[PDB]
Write a protein that binds this DNA or RNA. Structure first.
Ligand SMILES: [Mg+2]
Ligand SMILES: [Mg+2]
Length: 88
RNA sequence: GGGCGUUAAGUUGCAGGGUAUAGACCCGAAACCCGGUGAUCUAGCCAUGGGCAGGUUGAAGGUUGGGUAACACUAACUGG
């Protein structure tokens, strides 16, 4: 689950202060950040089915809570995906 | 007693009739063996030079976009 140090960086700008660790902005950011790095892990290995199963949770959850906010505070999303990368 | 002999002139030439060896009345095989001449046709190969109007289809490969959590996937265009 990446480094205990890491994510320290990403709570800023996304969050209003450090240890504001629960804004939906950050977890999404935490998830993507892992996922992205973590796609390297499945390049090599790749027949590591089990590890993948955990991945999709990250992806499922990410997407599930990326949909939550779509209902609350409009364009509190259109100010973060492009800020990050993903709307495919 | 028996068998074969003694009682029957031969021989050397010349001509003829046969026969033996020879091609041995004449013509005639398909073949067998020896030694030469042939890859200017043709089979294959070896160098060295030529030839294939015109019209199709459109593999791999590349680029881009869609698609994926990432892949798969898919669309043009390019390519030949
Ligand atoms: Mg562990
Ligand atoms: Mg010749």
């Amino acid at each position: 689950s990446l480094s205990t140090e890491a994510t320290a960086k990403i709570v800023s700008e996304f969050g209003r202060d450090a240890n504001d660790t629960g804004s939906t902005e950050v977890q999404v950011a935490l998830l993507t950040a892992q996922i992205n790095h973590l796609q390297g892990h499945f390049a090599e290995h790749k027949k590591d089915h089990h590890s993948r199963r955990g991945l999709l949770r990250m992806v499922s959850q990410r997407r599930k809570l990326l949909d939550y906010l779509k209902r609350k505070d409009v364009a509190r999303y259109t100010r973060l995906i492009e800020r990050l990368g993903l709307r495919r």
